[PDB]
């Protein structure tokens, strides 16, 4: 007894759903549609409702946009009476700082309360087998609520916040070798952090959603090691072209 024969990994080739159903028809594998009343429940939205583009050089038509945001605040106050706009930017700093300290100690149980499900993979996936040492040295300029907008069954509200503060980052590889950054010297950062909260959900809260990347941002710090970007791996019959 206690016998199970397993074959080697198959590694399905086609990833797309269409090809799977396009190849399931050639193989006769019929997959009837599902039937269920229960559906999944998403606490966070997939993407931003209205794209924000920060003005260049920040590092009539303009006035109207500020009023549109004020209108959306009313919606956020219909579901939460005790909510002010002169405290959230001070509250976002606590979340932002507290959400980046969970990466040093690998506190993923509390990190879900601070960030959304759309943001959590982006932060943790790359550092799964890496050591991070992030700190908040000082704050340069106070934060400001640049834009507030809500969605048109559930309703979510997004609050864009601008941050300008110094930070220290040192990323170490699996083996403890320095991979990126310097633990001694901080640097200025200008990143617009977006938050989201499911107003409908009585247990909802404000959590980080994503980071706006402006096209006019300075290049990031260079990495320590070198890279090789190979060219086309041509076949014998095919020839190389300039």
């Amino acid at each position: 007894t206690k016998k199970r024969f397993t074959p080697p990994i198959y590694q399905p080739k086609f990833k797309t759903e269409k090809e799977f159903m396009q190849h399931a028809r050639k193989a006769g594998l019929v997959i009837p549609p599902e039937k269920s009343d229960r559906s999944i429940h998403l606490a966070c939205t997939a993407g931003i409702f209205d794209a924000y583009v920060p003005p260049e050089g920040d590092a009539t038509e303009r006035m109207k946009k500020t009023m549109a945001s004020q209108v959306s605040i009313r919606r956020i106050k219909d579901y939460d009476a005790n909510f002010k706009i002169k405290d959230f930017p001070e509250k976002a700093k606590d979340i932002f700082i507290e959400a980046h300290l969970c990466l040093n100690n690998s506190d993923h149980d509390r990190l879900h309360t601070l960030v959304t499900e759309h943001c959590f993979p982006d932060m943790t996936w790359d550092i799964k087998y890496k050591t991070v040492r992030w700190s908040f040295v000082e704050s340069l300029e106070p934060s400001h609520v640049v834009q507030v907008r809500c969605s048109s069954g559930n309703v979510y509200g997004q609050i864009t916040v601008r941050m300008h503060t110094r930070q220290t980052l040192a990323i170490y590889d699996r083996f403890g070798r320095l991979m990126y950054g310097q633990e001694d010297v901080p640097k200025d950062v200008l990143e617009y952090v977006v938050f989201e909260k499911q107003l409908t959900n009585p247990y909802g809260s404000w959590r980080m959603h994503t980071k706006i990347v402006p096209p006019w941002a300075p290049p990031k710090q260079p990495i320590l090691k070198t890279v090789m970007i190979p060219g086309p791996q041509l076949k014998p019959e095919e020839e190389y072209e300039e």
Binding site: K235, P236, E237, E239
Partner: protein, 110 residues
């Protein structure tokens, strides 16, 4: 005739791991100056020999579309021409095989 006794793993490691049983390192390996792939000093490059066979096969498929059947070989010489070439001075009265492709750089016109 059957074994009188069982052979031990110690006896068998000395027979299996004898240097004669082991694979011998090869020192006749080098790089092809054309493609950069590996090759033996006395053997043709597998990579460069393969691209000759892909083109040679295409030329042999065109020859069949002209012969149009078996037992229809010519009594004259044959020439291969590519897009951007015309019969040469010496390539007169021959069987030109038109190829819809740019002439390979390695393929030198003679």
């Amino acid at each position: 005739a059957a074994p009188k006794n069982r052979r031990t793993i110690e006896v068998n490691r000395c027979r299996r791991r004898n240097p004669q049983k082991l694979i011998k390192v090869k020192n006749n390996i080098d790089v092809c100056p054309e493609c950069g792939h590996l090759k033996q000093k006395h053997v043709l490059c597998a990579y460069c020999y393969e691209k000759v066979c892909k083109e040679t096969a295409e030329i042999r498929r065109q020859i069949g579309k002209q012969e149009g059947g078996p037992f229809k070989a010519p009594t004259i010489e044959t020439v291969v021409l590519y897009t951007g070439e015309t019969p040469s001075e010496q390539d007169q009265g021959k069987r030109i095989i038109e190829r819809d492709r740019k002439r390979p750089s390695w393929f030198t016109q003679n």
